[PDB]
């Protein structure tokens with residue numbers, strides 16, 4: 001297990017998301033589905049010039065998996081997936097300029113729901129999750145598990161769980177008072193409201 005410090009700017013973003021009073025938390029789901037859609041567009045596009053990039057799986061989809069026993073909501077996609085370099089360096093680089101833009105917008109009168117427009121919607125997971133684990137596999141790299149409970153650090157390890165083929169699983173370890181996002185009716189409401197035109201099938205698993 002390797003431990004890394006977030007850049008100060010990303011840490012500050014995560015603290016803002018965790019600390020600001022903001023009742024409209026449900027938007028986290030829209031943001032992670034949008035992230036999945038983006039990742040799926042990428043593999044779909046790349047597969048047009050190189051069909052063998054789909055040898056790791058042809059199905060392009062998003063699954064939403066609630067688990068009351070574990071108190072987790074998992075968003076799974078079969079998108080392009082993330083490399084170790086993404087996890088350690090690249091995502092952070094993109095997040096830095098986005099965080100700065102988002103911060104300035106917020107002071108100008110924007111709200112937290114506009115986070116996605118700045119390319120840092122992933123961190124909205126921390127509206128509802130005390131801990132986020134991300135399992136991811138890109139065609140050019142190994143399966144990795146990224147994990148953070150914020151506090152300024154994240155971990156990366158090689159994953160030895162079930163091999164996933166290709167894509168990303170975002171596992172939300174929900175805060176004690178945010179278990180509404182495990183309820184079938186609540187998840188369906190949120191998807192219908194914010195994600196109804198996503199261009200990939202979204203399957204909400206039942207318990």
Ligand SMILES: Nc1nc2c3c(F)cccc3nc(Cc3ccc4c(c3)OCO4)n2n1
Pocket residue numbers: 035036039077079080081082086087091122134146168
């Ligand atoms: N599902 C999914 N696939 C991608 C992704 C991807 F598949 C390729 C490149 C970048 C990506 N960025 C994100 C957003 C993201 C940002 C920061 C993160 C993260 C995911 O996981 C750990 O830190 N996602 N989310």
